[PDB]
Every structure is written in C-alpha cells, then in structure tokens.
Symmetry: D2
Subunit: 339 residues, 4 copies
Amino acid sequence: MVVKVGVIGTGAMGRAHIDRLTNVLTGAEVVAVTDIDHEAAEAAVRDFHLNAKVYPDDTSLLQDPDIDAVFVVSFGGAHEATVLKALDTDKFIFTEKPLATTLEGAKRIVDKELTKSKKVIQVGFMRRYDQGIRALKEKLDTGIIGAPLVVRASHINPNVASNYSNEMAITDTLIHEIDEMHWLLDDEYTSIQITYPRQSAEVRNEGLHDPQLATLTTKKGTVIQVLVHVTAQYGYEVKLEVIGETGELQLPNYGLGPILRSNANQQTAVEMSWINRFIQAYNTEVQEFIDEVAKSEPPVGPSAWDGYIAAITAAAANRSQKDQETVLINVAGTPTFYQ
Amino acid sequence: MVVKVGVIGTGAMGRAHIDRLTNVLTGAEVVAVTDIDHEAAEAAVRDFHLNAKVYPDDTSLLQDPDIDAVFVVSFGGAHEATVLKALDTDKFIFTEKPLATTLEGAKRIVDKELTKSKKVIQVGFMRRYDQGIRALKEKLDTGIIGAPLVVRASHINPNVASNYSNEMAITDTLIHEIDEMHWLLDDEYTSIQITYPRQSAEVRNEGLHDPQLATLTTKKGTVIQVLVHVTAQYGYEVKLEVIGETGELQLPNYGLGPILRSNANQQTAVEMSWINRFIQAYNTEVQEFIDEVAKSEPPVGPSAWDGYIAAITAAAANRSQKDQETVLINVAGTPTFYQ
Amino acid sequence: MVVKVGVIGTGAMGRAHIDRLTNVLTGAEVVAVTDIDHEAAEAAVRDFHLNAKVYPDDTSLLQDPDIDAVFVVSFGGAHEATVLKALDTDKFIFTEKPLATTLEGAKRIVDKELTKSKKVIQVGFMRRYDQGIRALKEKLDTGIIGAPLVVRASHINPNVASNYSNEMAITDTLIHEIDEMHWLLDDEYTSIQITYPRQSAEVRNEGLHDPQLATLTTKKGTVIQVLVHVTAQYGYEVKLEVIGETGELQLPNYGLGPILRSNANQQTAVEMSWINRFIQAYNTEVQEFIDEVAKSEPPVGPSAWDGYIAAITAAAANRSQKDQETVLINVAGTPTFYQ
Amino acid sequence: MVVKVGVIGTGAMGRAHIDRLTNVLTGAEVVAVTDIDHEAAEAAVRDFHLNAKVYPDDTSLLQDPDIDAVFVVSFGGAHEATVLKALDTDKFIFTEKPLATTLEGAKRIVDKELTKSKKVIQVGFMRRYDQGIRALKEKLDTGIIGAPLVVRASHINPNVASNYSNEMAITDTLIHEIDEMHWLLDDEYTSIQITYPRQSAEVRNEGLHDPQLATLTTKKGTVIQVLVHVTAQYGYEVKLEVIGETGELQLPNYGLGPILRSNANQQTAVEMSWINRFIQAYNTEVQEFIDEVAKSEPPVGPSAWDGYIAAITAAAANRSQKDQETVLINVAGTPTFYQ
Ligand SMILES: NC(=O)C1=CN([C@@H]2O[C@H](COP(=O)(O)OP(=O)(O)OC[C@H]3O[C@@H](n4cnc5c(N)ncnc54)[C@H](O)[C@@H]3O)[C@@H](O)[C@H]2O)C=CC1
Ligand SMILES: NC(=O)C1=CN([C@@H]2O[C@H](COP(=O)(O)OP(=O)(O)OC[C@H]3O[C@@H](n4cnc5c(N)ncnc54)[C@H](O)[C@@H]3O)[C@@H](O)[C@H]2O)C=CC1
Ligand SMILES: NC(=O)C1=CN([C@@H]2O[C@H](COP(=O)(O)OP(=O)(O)OC[C@H]3O[C@@H](n4cnc5c(N)ncnc54)[C@H](O)[C@@H]3O)[C@@H](O)[C@H]2O)C=CC1
Ligand SMILES: NC(=O)C1=CN([C@@H]2O[C@H](COP(=O)(O)OP(=O)(O)OC[C@H]3O[C@@H](n4cnc5c(N)ncnc54)[C@H](O)[C@@H]3O)[C@@H](O)[C@H]2O)C=CC1
Ligand SMILES: O[C@H]1[C@H](O)[C@@H](O)[C@H](O)[C@@H](O)[C@H]1O
C-alpha cells in the first residue's frame, strides 16, 4: 500500500527528496508540505504537480492523520525540535543529517524514542548505501586483508558558498566520514584531532581553514586519516583506502564516462557535483525507508543512535578545531533498542 | 495515472520485467499476464503479489480494455505473431529483442505499424540505455576526436548452455552490437563478414564456432571489428573503442567493487553475469517506455525500424557464417514515420 | 675491446643511437659518420661531442679499416644498397628496420650474406627486447590463458613526415608487428589482408591511406588484427591484447609520468614518439650487438633472415594494398646458416 | 678517460655497486677494494673479474693516488670515520646512506668538507633519480596545481628480516622519504611526529612497531603524512600524492607486466623487491656521479648537507618514537657552498 509522506522543509534537499519520492522511487506519495517560506512550499506543490496540502508549520502538518511518514529537511538546527514533535505522533520519521546540532539534543531524541513501542527514526547518512563503499566493506569483512590497521580517506570538494564556515568543515562535510568509519570498521571511536596544514589561497571565507586533516582513533586501535579539502577546484571526489595486515583495499575511481585519448594525454572526467556523486545512495536509502514504512516495520538504516554518535564526534571535532588538540570520545554502549 | 500493463511470456525475462515494473520502477502496474505455460503465469501473479488476471493466450489478454501497454517476452519465434496481434489494438507495445526471428517477419511488422496513426512499438535493445555506452556516444558526438574511422569491440561471455547454436553467436550475442553500432555512429551498414579464427578447445556445442570475428562496413566508411567470444571462461565483458581522426574513446572498466592488493597482485573482480552487467540499462529502458505511455506519446527508444535493421543484418551475418564471405547490406531509406 | 662504430644516416634515429652509444651504453665509440645531408652529419658530431670523421658517403666510410661495425640508420629505402656494400667488408652490421623495402632487396642481402664465413647482420626489430612485451610473451607461454586464438594490436603514431608513403605504412610501420607476432606466437603466417577504413581528414601526404587495417592469419589458425594509424594526432602508442581460450593478456599503459587531477579531469601524459617509448628496447638490442662484436662473434639478435621473412609478408601486404584482397604467404625454411 | 674507483665495503650493496660499475654502466673501473672481512674483498675481486688491489684497510686504499673516487659501502656506523679520512685526500666520495649515524657525525663531515676548495661528496639517496618521482616533482614545479598543501605517501614492504628493529623503520626505511620530501617541496622541515596505530599481527620482531605513521611539517606549512608498513605482505610499493591548491598529483601504477583476465578477475603483478623497484634509480645515480668525476666537476646529486638534514630528521624521528610526541626540527639555512 502507498506510503503517504509529509515533507518539512522544501528547499534544495527537500525538493530533491520530493522529486525522488514522486518521480523516481516506488511506493510513496507526497501529500503534505510545509516550509517557513510558505511560497517555497507552494512552489514545491506546483513544480512537482503534487496532490498535497500546504500547512503553515510543522505542528499543523503533524496533525494530519493521513500521513504515514515525515521527512525532516529543514535547517539542521531545526531538526531536533521537529523530530521531537514527530515522536509525539505514531508517524515514521526520516530526518536528514544531522539528527540534531548538539549532542544534548541528540540525546533528548534518543531518550524519547526509547520510550516508544517501535523505532521510527532513520537519519540520512547516505554513504552507507553507496554501492562502492558497501562493496569495499563487504570485502573487508571477508578477512582477506586481515585486521584493519589504518584507513586513509579524502573528502574533496571544488569550492564553497560565501556562508560556509570553519565549523561546517566538520558539520557539513566531515560528518559523512564520521558516520561512515565506525560503521565500516564495526568499531567505536576513542579520539579525534583536527589539524590545519598551510592555508589555501583559494579560500574566500573569513575564518575558514582549508584544507583540514582529521585523525580519528578507534577502540581496536585503527587510525583513520581524513583529508578534508573543500576548495580543491578540480572536482568532487571521495576516496577510501583500508590498510590491512596482509593487504589493502581501495575504492575504484568513480565514473562510467569514457577514457579519452587526445592531445598528448589519456584522461577521464571527474565529477563536479556531489549531487551526481551520491544519486544512487540517496535513492537507495529512501527507497529502503519507504519499503520499511510500507510494512509498518522499523527502519533498518542509520538510527537516532547513529545520529548521537555522530553528534558526539562532531562536537569533539569542533572542540579540536579551537587549538588543534586531540579530544577524547567515549560513547555509551548501544542500547538493545538500537541493535 | 498508472500505466496498466499486460505481460505476455512470464519466463526468466518476463518475471524480471514484472519485478521491475512492480518493485523497482514507478508509474506502472501489471494487471494481466499470459504464458503458454499456464502454471508459470499463475505463479507470476502469486510471486509478485499482483492484482492481475491470467489469460489463456495473447489474444484474450489483448481484448482487456484496461490495459494500456503490453510487454512481449515470449520465445523469440513467438514475437512476430504477438506483435502483429497487438497492432490490432490501440495499446503500446514493448517487445523484447528480436522484433522477429526473420527478416520478413520484421518487415511485416513495420508495414503494419506504418498503417497506424502513431508509433507504438519499442524493441528491447537495452545497450542504448547503458550509462557507460551512452556516455561514450555523447563524448563522440562532441566532435572531440573527430570523425569515427574504426570501431573495435568485444562481446565476451564465459560459457554457454547446451542449446547455444552457431547462429546464436549472431542472433543472441552479436545482435546487441548490431543494433548498437549504427546508432553509435549515426550511420548505415553496407556489409557484414564473419570469420572463424582457430577453434577454441573450450567449445562443447555441436556446430558452434568460437570465437567469431565480425566485420561491418558503413556508408560513411567506418569499419567495425567485433570479437565474439562466448566460451571465454574468465568473465562477461563488453568492450568498445572508437578510433577517431584526432583521438580515441573507450569504455572504462565495468564495476564498483574494490581494488585488492594481496598476494603479489593488484586485482579487481570481473562480472560473470550479463544479467548483473545490464541491470541499470534494463531499468532505464523500461522506465522510459512507461513514461512515454503515461503521456500517451510514442516511444522514443529503439523502434520497429531498428528491429528491422537488426533483422536484416543478422540474416546477412547468418549467411556469412556459411562460408565466411562478405554479405552486402542495403537497408531501405527510413520512412518518415520512423524519423 | 671498445668497439669502433660508424653511423650511416644521422637523422632522428641515427642521433638517438649515437646518443645511446656515447652516453649510456658500454664498450663503444662512434668514430665516423656520414649522411647525404652533410650538415646533419656535422651536427651529429658536434651535438654528441664526438671525435669522429665525417665521410662524404657510405662507400668511403666503409673502406676505413679502423671501423669495427656500422649502423645503417638511413631512410628505409636506402638500407639495401648500403647493407650490400657493407657485406663487401668484414665489418659487423646493425641495420635499422626494414632490412629492405622490397622482397627482392631483402633476398639479395640474404643471398650475399650466405656467401660469407659468418653471420654479421643484426636487424633492429626492437620489439622482441621490450620488457613489457617480453613479460606478456612469458606469461602467455605458461599456458595460463590457454591457446592464443586472436591477437589485437594497435600501432599508433601522431603524425608522419612528408616523405612517408603509403607503402611505408607497411615497410616502416606494420613491419614491427609482422616481426613481432611470429616471434610472440612461435608461428608463421599463411596470409595477410589490408583494408582501408574511412580515410582520415588528418592525412597530409599524397597517396597515403590512413588508417589501415591488417589481418594476418597463422599456421595454427590464430588471427591477428592490427590497427595502423599514423596520423592519430593524440600520441604515440603500441597496444597488444592476446585472446586465449581461458583468459586474456594485455600490455599495460606505458608511462611513469604523474596522474594529474585538474579542471574536471584526471589525466596522464602519453608519449609522442618512439624515441622515449622504446628507449629500453633500443638500449638492450644495441648493447647486445656491441657485446657480440667485441667478442668477434655473430650477433644473436634478429637476423637478415628475420628481415627477409618479414619482407615476404610485407611484400604481400603491399600487394594487398592495391585491391584490398587477401594474399597468401608461405615462407621457406630457415637455412642452417641462420639457425 | 675512465674513472678509477675504490670500493670500501664489499657486502651486499658494495657488490651491487661493483656490478653497476663493472657490468652495467659506462666510464668507470673498480681498481681497488677493502673490507674488514678480507675474504669478502677477495671474493669481490674474484667474482667480478676485477683487475684490482685488495687493501688491508680504508687508510691504505685512500693513499693510492691512481684512485679518482671512492664508494663507501660499509656498515652505516662506519661511514663517518671513513668519509672524514677520505676528506684528507682530493678524491671524490660516493657514500651510501647514511652520511653518519649521528647528527654530530654528520655535522663534522659538513664542517670539514666546507673547508675544501670544492664539493666532493654525494650521498646515496636514490629516490631523487627515480623517473616517476622526478617526473612528479617537475610537474609540481610548473605550478599547475598551485601550492602544495599536503603530501600523502606510503612506504610499503612485504616482510622484514629478523634483525630489523624499530629504529630501522626510520633509518633504513622512512629515511628515503625524509630525504625526498624537502627536495620535492623545496622546503625545510620544522617538525616530525611518529605515531603507532594498532600493532600488526604479522610482526615477528622484538620492539618493532608496525605500521608507523610519520607526520612532518615544513616551514611553508605543508603537512606530510607517511605510512610506513614493513610487514604488509602483499608487495613492495612506494606511493606519493601531492595535494595542491587547485589540483593533485600522484605517482602512476608501477609495472610493465601484463594485465591478466582470468578466473573472474583482472590482475597485475606487484613488485616484491625493493631491489628491483629502484634498479633504474641506482643506475642513474651512479652514472651521474661517474659522469661528474669524469669531467672533474663536483657531484650534483644529494650532498653532505642533504645527509645532515636526513640525520637531524632521523634523530628527531627516533626521539619521537619513544613517546609519540612531536619533535621540533630547526635546520640552519643552507651554506652557499651547498647551493
Ligand atoms: N545527506 C546529505 O548529503 C545532505 C543533507 N542535507 C541536509 O538537508 C537539510 C536541508 O538542507 P538544504 O536543503 O540544502 O538547505 P536549504 O536551505 O536549501 O533548505 C532548507 C529549507 O528549510 C526551510 N526551513 C528552515 N527552517 C525551517 C523550519 N523550522 N521549519 C520548516 N522549514 C524550515 C527553509 O526555508 C528552506 O526552504 C539540512 O539539514 C542539510 O544538512 C542537505 C544536502 C545534502
Ligand atoms: N534484451 C535482452 O538482453 C534479453 C532479451 N531476452 C528476450 O526475452 C525473450 C524471453 O526470453 P526468456 O525470458 O529468457 O526465455 P524463457 O524461456 O525463460 O521464457 C519465455 C517464456 O515465454 C513463454 N512462451 C513461449 N511462447 C509463447 C507464446 N506464444 N505466448 C506466450 N508465452 C510464450 C514460455 O512458456 C516461457 O515461459 C526472448 O526473446 C529473449 O531473446 C531475454 C533475455 C535478455
Ligand atoms: N626501430 C625503431 O623503432 C625505429 C626505426 N627507425 C628507422 O630508422 C631509419 C631512419 O629513420 P629516422 O631517423 O627516423 O629518419 P630521418 O628522416 O630523421 O633520418 C634519416 C636520415 O637518413 C639520411 N639518408 C637518407 N638516405 C641516405 C643514404 N643513402 N645514406 C645516408 N644517409 C641517408 C637522411 O638525410 C636523414 O638524415 C629508418 O629505417 C626508420 O625506419 C626510426 C625510428 C624508430
Ligand atoms: N640506498 C639504499 O637504498 C641502500 C643503502 N644501503 C647501505 O649500504 C651500506 C651497506 O649495506 P649492506 O651492503 O646492505 O650491508 P652488508 O653488511 O652486506 O655489507 C657491509 C660490508 O661492509 C664491510 N665493512 C663493515 N665495516 C667496514 C669498515 N669499517 N671498512 C670496510 N668494510 C667494512 C662488512 O664486512 C661488509 O662486508 C649500508 O650503509 C646500507 O645502509 C644498503 C642497501 C640499500
Ligand atoms: O620508423 C618509425 C619506427 O619504425 C617506429 O617504431 C614506428 O612507430 C613508426 O611508425 C615508423 O615511421
């Protein structure tokens, strides 16, 4: 039966999710929208030819009994309150990352969800759905390279908007690696440290350090070195290498485009848009959510607990940014509810 | 509104299309099925949880007024009669390849379709929807390597079933390149020639020559060299290189799986299944057809005319297979109906 | 002993051989040069800091008793007369390919050398010395991919000089593959056919067809498909793929230059000339020649017989060029002198 | 005229250099040897068919006026004393790494040589001569990727002998990166920090931590992250990536061996031997030294100053190994003598 969806926040990613649900994926319909910019919400309805009602706020939308699930796609800082409101209903909840912008907010959500008769929140950490990354994890898990010793990763982005701040290097960019690595390794973090190499001349934003180097450590002692470089110019790229005791695994170059021999070079295109890079993962993640809601079963994707882990680690990273010193992480054990 | 589909032939590929239409793609519903094996048809209904009627044959299914489009997914030899029957209705028609198993059957279909007010047939030549192959064509069409002079291609398959005949090297295997190349090059074929290199010791089928080399010439003068190797053992692989005046284009490695460094080698997995190789293409191809039907517009994918070109070329190749001599091809000018 | 060398022809490759003999290789000194362009000869002496005599012609240089060995590095069509003259002396002879530009010329050389007390000619078929190509042959010979069924090869040049003729597409270019494949496969040819794809707009030489396709068949039934493309623009490249019963072997991309990520592309440099692509092969073959001369022993590298065997096939291809028809080949057995 | 060489220390690398001078390269002759193991010295002369005198010690060898240059290939701890002695002569000096085993020893050599009328010492840091590494440096120096911000490198080795110590991870292994980076970047080091990920189960040596992570900083702010992994099992590999403001540069795939398609995989061999990996670099380095001596000009390769830089940095790294703390490095501005 069709999953009736309400969307809270009809901006860039909200519209992208509306588009997915309407024109790409199967088994859902958007029947309600709201945005603090009412005209934006109206436009979403028009642009996507929805049979949907526009509500003036989240509270009103959440009162609609016909809605089976809500998508929270507002500003990050608005997620916490909205998710908490939604938990007063029986509706399933897909929230874009972050779960909340503070670790305390995340904890509030976890604590509230724990009181319920079903897990209902999935968080939009799409990396876990990317076919390439999953294939690497699968291969790692065969034991073929032994224990993971070091992970080297890159998060490369061409340029940023004028409103992109230093802290967003963590909260908008590194956050993906923050969620991914503990999942990839089936391990828990023990520390994070952010260091600043020489400042790029390409940076146009006051206070923004770029590139940034992030070193994370895990309980088993695996060290993760992430390069974050958001004014890299050349392209958008995600790189991942796992160094094991007996071998290595790395993600192949992304892209299906041809190899060009021309002008004394052999070349392949590099993606310029994060949007295109993770199109598959976004579709897969959302389809999975919808498929679960259709069965009235709890989501199986990243949970509020994953959101909490991410928020704790992001907080630690933002602390590290202040003086470039290592910050310890010690997350509580995973409640059975979230296993 | 949803496109209501009837499926004629509920075998391996018929079920795969049903699965696509039901569980993967958007905007369609299978409401009717038929198969000469009635038990298979019934199973398809149960297996995919369809709300669908099982009909004794194609004729009866075709009388169902609720059906917007039919999928013809029976034995190749059955396609012609069914497509001709379907053309007595107003319904849209997706037929799997081949359009017909004979040249004359293909023309009968074309002649019949030409009598209609709009085009309704799409033929399942999915290569055109493969992202890698499409990306190559697109790059070619930028002019960046100048005019295409030579095409070198491979269709590699690990092993064949006992029913695989010499002529199937053309009709089941090369057929894909036959449809693909004239599209790739915006050109028309003038001849085809099949040669037999030394016979592989891996061949276990009566009368099968393997490998086979196919050489096609085009009106603009491009020479196409295809290696067909169906007992290759190592994997399933589709390779494509275009040699231009000022450069070359080739398909990259297919696969998202990781690069493994282990035991004095660096390695990546090779696909063993054509099914897996073309999952995406099948999805894109069918979604497009459904999207067209939903708008009541003619299909924009490979047409009955393309089916005809394929059939003519395949026939010529089968003739060449008899003595390894060149066989001329002179395809009629495209009717405006198919422009 | 330091081998005293004379060089006949001091153009691009003459200079390159002088360079290697003077600065890289051991046990040789260039003591004499000649070129029909006196200024070119003088430039070679100057540019490579030689204490060398500049002779007005080959005959005078050949009559200098102090010269131990001569290198024939003139225009291909000039090799025959020079080699024949040199055979009137007791000097060792390294000639670049081709041995001659006609079958009759090659035969004249063989007939003359057979009258001598020992073998003195080495032909510059350097492909056999290339580490990559050798490594491929070695792997093939392990049986890991079973019997070789088809070979696909490319011989790519960016452009040609004004003196490059249609006939030279065979005698200067394809001649490498002619020698290479029979060595690689330990097989002999039964036929050759040259075909002319769509003529490139990049051709600037009257009478030159480019690209050209060569199909060679061997006694064991292996079919070799060579692409000759000498106005390719993009670079200089040699490609080799062997299709076996149970697998494939391919030469990797050549180059040590870096991978550049820049401007929405990932790219690596392509060689623009043989001079660098085959520097190792040239070094090895020439050092081997010099080492034999130093011991007053016959060369162990490719012989005038190899040159003649190649010339037979080359002449067959030149015949095929006229009408694009297949030409049969059946070479004589190797004389004892050349075993 | 031929460069007459004396070799001090005729062990593994000593014999390798003798072989280079005797068989591989042009313009030199080994005319004297010495080793504390007088039988090793005798074996060298014998095995390589040398016309050389065996001297009882370095002092006696250095007094031989016919010797143009000496190679110091004894135990590392024995270089300092031997070098300082040779500096009492006018002979050119090629010393293997290290220049000295202490920065104090290195400083003494630097001070002594600085009193001489011209530079005579080259240190055997062969990385700088590796074609790929040089090609990358050169591309970097074009400015095409802007300023270097981060360098990521790997020094991967399959296994170690029973005598390999924790300190050797620096002195024998990382030392190559230690010399290479400041040269690559034309910059000076300001700090080094060694950190230990989880210990590999493959380690069989008391006290050896593997892998190790080395972080170096430069004056311009470039951060260098090196992974040292000496029990990696899979192969020997050197990886290098430079992250620039506007792009990236990395070393390409190393290897000439074929690509094998077999058994559901595509694979290429990985080098297992550091010896084989850097064969070319060793040859080029020594040939350049000989060429300089031949012209009676100072060496142009890595100098005593470079050896001093390496010694300081290695000492700092050995210190950091104790507690994983960052150790500052302050190298004096280069004397013009060494520019
Ligand atoms: N998982 C991923 O890779 C990505 C996640 N996101 C997340 O999606 C969320 C939205 O980002 P964008 O769409 O790019 O930003 P956006 O700025 O384009 O849109 C946000 C929308 O939310 C509306 N809004 C703000 N506060 C609201 C509230 N309290 N209630 C209702 N509506 C409100 C705004 O008016 C705006 O239309 C963010 O949390 C972002 O981090 C965004 C892009 C990629
Ligand atoms: N485009 C592509 O890549 C592919 C195309 N195909 C095409 O799909 C068609 C079906 O192939 P598969 O599903 O693999 O074969 P299959 O043998 O598994 O299924 C064929 C089904 O058709 C039924 N059938 C036969 N004659 C019929 C008729 N007159 N009316 C109704 N049903 C009839 C059979 O009972 C069977 O259930 C073939 O034409 C094949 O060439 C199949 C696979 C891939
Ligand atoms: N093995 C290989 O990969 C290569 C082989 N070659 C061969 O080397 C030879 C020379 O080629 P390039 O140096 O590239 O050509 P080039 O055109 O640069 O030089 C040819 C030189 O020969 C001189 N010459 C012509 N006729 C002469 C004669 N009768 N006596 C003396 N000198 C004469 C010309 O004046 C010119 O200086 C050819 O046989 C060519 O096929 C050339 C390049 C690569
Ligand atoms: N640049 C590179 O990649 C490499 C550098 N090396 C360096 O080469 C040097 C020698 O290494 P190996 O040959 O591997 O060691 P090895 O132990 O095989 O040989 C050293 C030889 O020196 C002799 N010896 C020791 N002290 C001596 C003294 N005071 N005077 C004369 N002879 C003496 C020993 O008896 C022995 O025969 C070391 O400094 C090593 O670090 C070695 C291998 C590679
Ligand atoms: O003489 C050169 C030489 O034979 C090269 O190796 C070949 O690549 C060029 O085509 C030819 O003109």
